[PDB]
Amino acid sequence: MKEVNVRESSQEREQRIQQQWQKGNVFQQSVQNREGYPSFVFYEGPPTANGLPHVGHALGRTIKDVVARYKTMTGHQVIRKAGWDTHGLPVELGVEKQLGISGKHDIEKYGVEAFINKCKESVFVYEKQQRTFTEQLGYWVDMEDPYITLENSYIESVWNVLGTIHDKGLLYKGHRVSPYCPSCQTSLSSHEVAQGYKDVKDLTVTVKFKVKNRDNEYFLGWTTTPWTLPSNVALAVHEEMSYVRAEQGDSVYIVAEALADKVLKGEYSVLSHHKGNELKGMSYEPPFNFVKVEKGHEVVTADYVTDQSGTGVVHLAPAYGEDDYRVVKENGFSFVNVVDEKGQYTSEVPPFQGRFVKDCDVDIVRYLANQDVLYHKEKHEHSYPFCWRCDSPLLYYANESWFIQTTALKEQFLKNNESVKWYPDHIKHGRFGKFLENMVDWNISRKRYWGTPLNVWECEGCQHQVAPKSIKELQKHASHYVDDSIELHKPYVDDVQLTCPVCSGEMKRTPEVIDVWFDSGSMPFAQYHYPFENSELFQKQFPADVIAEGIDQTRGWFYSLMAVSTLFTGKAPYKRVLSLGHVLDENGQKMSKSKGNALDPVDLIHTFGADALRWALLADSAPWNPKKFSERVVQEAKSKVIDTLVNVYGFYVLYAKLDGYDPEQTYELKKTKLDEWILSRLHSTVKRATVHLEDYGFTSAAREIAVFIEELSNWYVRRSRDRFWSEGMDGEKAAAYDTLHEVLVTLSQLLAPFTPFVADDVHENLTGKSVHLADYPACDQTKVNEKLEKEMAAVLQVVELGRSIRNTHSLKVKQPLQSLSLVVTEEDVEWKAYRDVIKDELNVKNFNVEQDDDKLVSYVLKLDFKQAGPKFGKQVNEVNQALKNLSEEKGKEFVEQGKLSVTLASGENLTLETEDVLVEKVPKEGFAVASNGMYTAVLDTALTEELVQEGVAREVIRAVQDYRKKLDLPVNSRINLELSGDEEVQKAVAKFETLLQENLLLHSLSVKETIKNGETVKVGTKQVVLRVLNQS
Ligand SMILES: CC[C@H](C)[C@H](N)C(=O)NS(=O)(=O)NC[C@H]1O[C@@H](n2cnc3c(N)ncnc32)[C@H](O)[C@@H]1O
Ligand SMILES: [Zn+2]
Ligand SMILES: [Zn+2]
């Protein structure tokens, strides 16, 4: 079974394991071997094929992989089909940059087909880069037969979904004020808008509107967007709000009563009161008269007008605000637009014609000053929407768009969300639920070229709508031949016309493509070409038991999945969501190619291994909140966890080969208490890690396993090395091999979801079988020993205290010390059974357990000046010296009694209060103390000549052993040793001759004054010459 561990880099090991997986079809087999087992349904969120993966993209892939691998080992069939997101602005803008073009006109000049072909080439390149990263990460997901949103079958399924929605009356065209990108030149959905808010500072202005058929009378109108003033059509007031005409100097101003003292400043006199109902119908003069409004420039009532802020009179521009649009339409007032598709001023506004409307703000203000209509200006700091792709400021623009009527099913939305288990829980009614509660209809139409065509044909004659669900329906309705090979993209589908079933007129397809989020949201149905194929497989693969993606999908794939599934089937498409916090750099800053702070995950995988990167991503911090990350954490994962497992595994393999241990052979076993302890810790770790994984606590399970690995290396193997080093297969050595074999097999199984490469290396070399075809190990409670674990933990605490004392007092563990005393308050731990271990680890001749420190401490008394200065006056220092002069028993007496007296030099006796004396408990001479509260270790640090000489003899023994290894001698060869050194070394060697002979297989030992051709070694601070003569 066991072959060998070799000097190989992490990359070489992982490449070898990957090749093993390829030759054996291990991923395929881990799916197929679970046929007939219960299903665990997993949906892969399709990464966008528009860029190179960064380290953040390794998080979800890792977590998904863990889940899938874990669910496979606990007896589920987990089908994993990969997907790529290939449409939309996320691809189009990058391709435009590659081509050095921008805007729809440039694309039309370039050619729609040529631009689309460029998009296809780009997405293919990025797909391959993503695929290589995914394979090197060890995330098993089928990328040889993935779903791709640009494939015809996927688009046909999307078309079927959209047509079914249209059948329900929930897909409609409407002229609405929608968020709009002036650069991308398209409307955007509400989730896209939610992804792009930034804090900005701009100007809100109060402007005078001359009342008509009056003189020196002006309405005070308010706006937060000065650039819409040329498009003014009306002024809005609340009908039940009280307004005032107030004289100020030569003029009269109309303003809300509650706001007049704020708007009017310096001097004013209120002449009359009017309700907003009365101000209705009064005409006025617009600040800009470039635009001609045939019906407008009046005052109207609107219930949303507030007296909390502004003036109570609100400028209304119907094309650039939803409320303005609704109110202007209700009163019959006319709709005017002064902005082109790029956000620039149209010809109807001459002075700024051809400039972005927002950038014209400042000039507008001065223009207002030159017409003498400005009244106030104020800075406004607020959240404003920016495009989630181009980063341009958005505009609210009247535009004809296609909507999915999500609001019609809002209740069902909420119901479906109520059935979903969210990790972390707060997303359910927080980030996600709050977005559901504020639902607006889904604007899906994009005036772009690369994407899923909106499959709605409209009759030029009577505007009847037909939405083909399939290529067959498209062919059926077409007025001309349509080949079976038709590609469902622009411009090919724009050359397909239909005959209107109503009037036989020409039906043309609406030109738009759909929002990319619809493509990804349709994957449960489109990944298997439902309902045209794989109906049984689709039924078995719906809904998902889990999905796991980043938190941004709360305004993304989580929403688009929920929306498409609710509109199409009414059902929730997933039962459970893992919403992952984004990975940041070590400073907490978001990683970007522009910033240059993005770590290359491929380089990290090459340097430290995918196992290390995954472990760092899982164990350094939880996946729910934003995660600081660094190369250092990957380094620490590799050195502390992965390397440790590899070293233990190689140790086992080497010595099992040398001693000819065969796990199939039945040996007589003499299991020690350390074997039992490590087995108990193993099965306890199995239990706790399983419990955490069942609740998707990856971090806690990883940390538990890491604790077990540290205990296995630093304590079990290190203290059991002699049993592997010894010669002859006694019961104790066989028990050691059996214990380590069980630990390695079960541990590699536990680690299989976390660190798949090294886990398979260990498991396959030890068992001949891949760990990823294995069952997750069960906890054997009969091997759990809670008492032994508790006692061993106490022993470890004592050992750490002893080491701390030795380090504080520069007493190297190679130097034996006389005693350790452990003061313990309770008989919790059977210390006797561990005496040897403790005496071994701290190198002490005696280990004594005491219930009190009476025999180990003394008391030293001093005076508290801050509490007793005035009482003793000039005698304070004399009293303090007398206190420092009392005997040990006097200090013990003060500690017991609390009352003390000091007899000063003059013979005067003085009484000391408890608060006057500062008490110090010191260790007895030669002793040093460390304490964790529960345990107090007192170490005898006093050195004798005998102790020092024993230390020198130990150093000589070690030097001789090292020299024997250096000269490559047989382990059974008895040697003639010649030793030269000063008299301290000679006396130490002579006194401990017996010990040297027990620890060295010496035929003769000669102490010589001078050694010819001898090796000079360092024994402590001394130099000693050694020489071997026979059997060298
Ligand atoms: C589910 C996929 C969506 C439909 C879409 N194609 C998309 O967002 N595609 S992506 O490639 O941009 N994102 C892939 C996954 O990585 C997450 N992610 C993106 N940026 C980070 C980051 N900085 N830190 C951690 N995770 C991050 C996404 O949420 C998605 O899960
Ligand atoms: Zn944009
Ligand atoms: Zn018609």
Author numbering: 1 to 1032
What do the study authors state?
Mupirocin, a clinically used natural antibiotic, inhibits isoleucyl-tRNA synthetase (IleRS), an enzyme that links isoleucine to its tRNAIle for protein synthesis. Two IleRSs, mupirocin-sensitive IleRS1 and resistant IleRS2, coexist in bacteria. Specifically, type 1 proteins (IleRS1) are strongly inhibited by mupirocin (Ki in low nanomolar range), while IleRS2, which are homologous to IleRSs from the eukaryote cytosol, exhibit resistance to mupirocin concentrations that are about three orders of magnitude higher. The amino acid is first activated by ATP to form an aminoacyl-adenylate (AA-AMP) intermediate, followed by the transfer of the aminoacyl moiety to the tRNA.
The displacement (shift) of the HIGH motif in IleRS2 is of utmost importance for the accommodation of the non-canonical A/GXHH motif and emergence of hyper-resistance.
